[PDB]
């Protein structure tokens, strides 16, 4: 990244660096999947990849396991005469590993909430979230010459980091029976 | 030197110097090269992207 | 009613004046009970406020920029513990124990005085003048697009219309770019369900506890009505 | 016929209405009960028929996932050495 | 087309395992007499896997919608979708030359990255009877 | 025959002068709600189409190249949603909402005004003028030998007896090639069982929705009486 | 019609109904109970 | 570079270099390059496509 360098040679050999670096990314993923259901019945929908696993093992039990990396809704509404729904929902995301790309033995992320809530239909709630704060500092530094005011920043190696990662779901129920009523 | 695209010339000095020319540098106020080869032949390909 | 008020009433934890104790910390620190938080647990504290004041408010520093001209930033004091009170040790230190409302109290954070404020029920009805129209940013949360409810800070050319108006309706504006065109992109406000109950503390920005009727808002978007 | 309602389920029904105090026919492929039975019950098994041939209501559901990540990280590492008197941090 | 798995588990199990990465709709219609149907239907959009064209560990892509709808004849819903909108930034800079206005530009490093995509399936069934009736 | 015609008339997306929006589109966009097609959701677009007609169709752009020494294409604007209404908003955009069609507007697409034109099930019993024989191309589907019935676009001169006469027989035409005495292949036309029902949009094509009887036959084939 | 309820746990309620000293019917659709019985 | 049909003639220079010819740059302005047969073969069989 970046560096200064001093040198002398001549009269003495002092080389003095500094090398910093610093680091700023921001990312902000927004996946929606929208899926119509008849009420009291059961609607999927899933995008995403099954990785397998080849466990044939030999005494008859041939797994060729699977899983699918994806996003993915799973929902049982049941709809209440005002315009409500109380819905067992099961909201998943979740990532190919790349141990699994790695034909190693493969990790893959999840990041799922599943549970049952009642919405009016105009109405959004967040079924789950979590944030993550991390808060990372690091000093290092000669204690003689870290003492100097001047000299310590010379002499004194600080990494800082901070990395906050929020995940959060929503949900909001339109009936279509206010259409499909109609029609 | 940069991240998206690093480019950190100093280390491709280096590879010039391996290509030929000749660098004194006996203080920071002091330095001095010729017969560089490392300019079109390093910059272009490192700079291909 | 009372209920949401309730939930507003627990969010209640953000407070003015920053810059005070940011020029004078009262530090807290101690070993003795290893924790960063506690319910009732002794932690020391380094500062006249040992002293004096018994009970005290507990705040990390947020900012909130606006007026970028002015270029000025009135913080958010996010108060930790909901209470403390104090015994007084030499050294200018303290022992104090912690009624704790949910806000982990970092060993080495920053204390404040105790300013109790009342807070009531009336402002359920709402009290909307459209003529306020700011933009929103520094949540707690941080999160944009946070929805059903959550504490936002109304900005200060927005905050001296929140000291006319209390109520106003959420707007996200989103960009339409012109791709097969010009692909020139121009930001266009959506109403979104849902409106801002707003608590205005003078002299810093307005704490809104927004109720948001499904539309999920980024964390700077317009609140306008 | 009953197209919202199975006819097996219509059958059912008209075991409730026989439970309340009588040949029923089931067609599969048209969902359509034919039953050769008292008028009254047949008339109370008709309502229960218009009650359940009701449509099904259809609901579009979106709940949506935002993932926000925010990463500030600054290193800064300080170097001062000298091998002429053998002074090097 | 189906990729197998050789899972020949000696014990008796031999699974010729296979799965077909395919467009697919599996329907059930049900018809009411007001020209609507109600259909459920199974709607699959699946690509063969790169990794099983590896012949490595096989991840096929499935984007697959399975619901029971209540649609009139000439009339087309929307039985799933899904966008997805990645926004990503990132900025590296050395901070003293980074704050310069005209040199920050020559050392920060910019990468902006937005890729969306998103995945639709409507559906609509025209009655054959139409014709079938007067046929 | 109404159901015939019912299937026909959700078949009747197709409409006359490419040319006119090809030279002023109504651009669509919009990412508020990032969608290729809703019913009722919100789309922006840019144009005085906002600022005038409410409702709208949408239409993808085929071309019908007939008359190779005029080289002329008619094109084919496949009407995408059934209909749309329009809130105005500044900056010359709209926010619409969309009763939808079978077919997905495309977030980049052109849109063109609303032309309400009426169809009867009168077309039913047929009008059959023998005289007017003409090539058929360009349809939707792309597909050769599609069946049961389509909606086919007849050629020009085609068209012109068209206005003349609304029914005719279908002929695909297959080469025959004397393969053992001179490789010369002859084409002949072979009457298929089938029949088109035509409704004209003079100055522009004929769309007709053919009824197959089992032939299969090519985009290009003769249609004749 | 119990939307809250599910129709066999209706259908229970009305049978401890009956314990406490007759004709129920459910639909599974609607989650709606009839029943032909006394009227108290 | 393009992308498409990328191309890069800067790293065709290195390979031009490589051939034999003398390119000579001490600064951005001055810059010269003789006995250069990269041209006729790099480019022939690069954008053979």
Not at chain 1, 125 to 134: A, R
């Given at each position: ?5 001093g040198?002398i ?12 670096m ?6 902000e993923?927004?996946?929606?999947p929208?899926?119509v ?6 609607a999927?929908?899933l995008?995403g990849s ?16 699977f ?10 509404p ?12 099961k909201?998943?995301?979740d990532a190919?590993?790349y141990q699994?790309?790695?034909?190693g033995?493969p990790?893959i992320n ?13 109405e959004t ?10 808060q ?9 010459l ?7 920043r ?10 906050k990662n ?13 259409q499909?009523?109609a029609? | ?17 391996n290509?030929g020319p000749?660098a ?8 001095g090269?010729?017969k560089?080869?490392?300019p ?6 490192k700079?291909?992207? | 009613?009372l ?12 407070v003015?004046d ?14 003795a009970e ?7 647990d ?7 406020f040992?002293?004096?004041q ?6 990390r520093?947020?900012?909130?920029y606006?007026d970028?001209?002015?270029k ?8 930790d513990?909901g209470?403390?009170?104090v015994?007084?040790?030499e ?23 105790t ?14 003048s459209?003529?306020?129209k ?15 409810f959550?504490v936002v ?14 109520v ?9 770019v ?5 692909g020139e992109?121009?930001?266009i406000p959506?109403?979104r ?14 704490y809104?506890l927004?109720?948001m009727?499904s539309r ?10 | ?11 059912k ?12 026919t ?13 008028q009254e ?8 028929v ?12 979106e709940?949506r ?8 990280d ?6 001062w050495?000298?091998?002429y008197?053998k002074?090097?941090w």
């Open positions: 990244s970046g560096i200064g360098i040198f040679t001549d009269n003495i050999i002092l080389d003095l660096q500094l090398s910093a610093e680091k700023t990314g921001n990312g993923i927004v996946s929606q929208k899926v259901t008849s009420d009291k019945e059961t999927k929908i995008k099954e990785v397998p696993y080849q466990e044939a093992s030999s005494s008859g039990a041939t797994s060729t396991s899983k699918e990396a994806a996003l993915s809704l799973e929902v049982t049941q709809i209440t005469p005002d315009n409500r729904i109380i819905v067992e929902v909201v998943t995301k190919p590993d699994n790309m790695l034909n033995v990790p999840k990041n799922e909430v599943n549970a049952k809530i009642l919405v009016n239909d105009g709630i967040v079924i789950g979230g979590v944030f993550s704060n991390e990372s500092k690091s000093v290092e530094k000669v204690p003689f870290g003492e100097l005011p001047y000299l310590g010379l002499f004194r190696r600080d990494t800082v980091t901070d990395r929020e995940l959060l779901v929503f949900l909001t129920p339109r009936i279509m029976n206010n499909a009523i029609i | 030197s940069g991240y998206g695209k690093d480019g950190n010339i100093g280390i491709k000095d280096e590879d010039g110097m290509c000749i004194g540098s006996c203080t920071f106020p002091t330095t090269t010729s560089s080869p490392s079109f032949v390093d910059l272009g390909a700079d291909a992207t | 009613p209920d949401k008020i309730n939930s507003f009433l627990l969010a209640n934890r953000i003015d920053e810059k005070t104790f940011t020029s004078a910390p009262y530090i807290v620190a101690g070993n290893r924790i960063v938080s506690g319910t009732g002794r932690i020391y504290a380094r500062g006249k040992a002293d004096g018994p009970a005290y408010g507990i705040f520093q947020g900012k909130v606006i970028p001209k002015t000025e930033v009135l913080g958010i004091n996010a108060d513990i209470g403390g009170e015994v007084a040790t050294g200018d230190v303290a022992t104090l124990a912690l009624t704790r409302t949910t806000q982990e109290v970092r060993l080495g954070d920053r204390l404040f005085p300013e109790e404020r009342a807070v009531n029920s009336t402002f359920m009805p709402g009290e909307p459209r003529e306020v700011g933009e929103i940013i520094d949540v707690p949360r941080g999160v944009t697009q946070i929805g059903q959550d800070t109304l900005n200060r050319g927005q905050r001296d219309g929140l000291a006319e108006g209390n106003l309706a959420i707007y996200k504006v989103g960009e339409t012109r791709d097969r065109v010009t992109s121009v930001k959506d109403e369900a849902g409106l801002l109950m707003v608590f205005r503390t003078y002299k810093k920005l307005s809104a927004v109720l009727a999920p808002l980024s964390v700077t978007d317009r609140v306008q009505n | 016929q009953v197209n919202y309602a199975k006819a097996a389920d219509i059958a029904l008209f075991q409730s209405v026989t439970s309340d105090g009588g040949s029923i089931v067609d599969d492929r048209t969902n359509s009960i034919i039953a050769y039975q008292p019950r047949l008339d109370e098994l008709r309502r229960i218009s009650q359940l041939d009701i449509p099904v209501r259809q609901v579009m559901i709940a996932i935002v993932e926000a990540n925010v990463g500030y600054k290193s800064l590492g300080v170097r050495g000298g091998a008197h002074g090097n």
